[PDB]
Symmetry: C3
């Protein structure tokens, strides 16, 4: 079932704002986009406190360089109970002080979003890393 | 000339599902998104006609990935709907290839022009023309 | 807060056409998407003539190769006075005659768009280059 244009637009804006916070080191604001008990599976982090700690930790890998998350090829579907399911491609570019760019291994991501007080929030995120999948075959 | 929001959303979902199938090695499902007699024009000038030829070409081309994982990325997409429902798009595309060792290759970028048509209410690919930017540069 | 689906679509088409022109060396057509007195902050360029000349000059860095601009993670909001504000991630790929793809340092871009005779045009563009931000911190 195709999503309504309003839902599709709302989803694009949710992800843009969520990733701007994560990439901008607003780890608490990033985690606040998740509901209590949200499941983030890379190993699972459950709930915003754990998700905030993980984003802070994973950001350590960038040192002082600047990450940017890139999403594309995103499916969006609304269930009758209002839950939104997405699947998409994601990567992170990492730009150094000298202008070098590293492109991280791509991921295939599956999300569920829920509406809380009229606004979308992340309920579940499951990340499949393409290098690990390749390695496993 | 702007596409309706419904059409724009429909196009984004068509392409997301189409590339998920191709990148996931569902070459039959990828080819099934094309109509009978669809024309697929490769960067080099070879044309594949019909979904069966397109499936065979897509499977053969995937050999270049050598067990690594491709991901197609589209961006900067124009969308135009003709009065008869035919949809024309143009966009940028590239492919990343991620290996078991975490290597990421970025393939030469392409400029792609498609036509889509509606069959029993759903979009299908009718024409795809790929211009590869390295080949364009070489000709210049 | 959320843009109408019509506005969202119009913005994607505006940017697709603007970048196709710039990447295709249609520097005048690129500049025509800006209003008179538009401000482009890299140094500031004011007006379509200066923006065209600067874009032509900047393209010299590609040296016979083919650039492609990639935007993603785009916020879109309409202000009460009809001004449209966007923020997005941008990078440029540069593909050589041998198919080597250079990936330029990423940018965080903030635009304002305005409607002129019913048509969207760029009023202001401010580019923050991520390597320079990293260097500064």
């Amino acid at each position: 079932k195709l999503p309504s244009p309003e839902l599709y637009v709302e989803v694009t804006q949710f992800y843009a704002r969520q990733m701007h916070r994560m990439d901008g080191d607003d780890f608490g604001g990033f985690a606040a986009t998740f509901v209590a008990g949200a499941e983030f599976r890379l190993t699972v982090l459950t709930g915003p406190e754990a998700i905030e700690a993980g984003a802070r930790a994973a950001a350590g890998r960038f040192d002082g360089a600047q990450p940017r998350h890139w999403f594309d090829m995103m499916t969006v579907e609304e269930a009758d109970d209002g839950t939104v399911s997405t699947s998409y491609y994601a990567t992170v570019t990492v730009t150094s002080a000298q202008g070098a760019v590293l492109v991280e291994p791509t991921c295939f991501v599956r999300d569920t979003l829920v509406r809380v007080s009229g606004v979308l929030r992340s309920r579940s995120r499951v990340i499949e890393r393409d290098d690990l999948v390749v390695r496993a075959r």
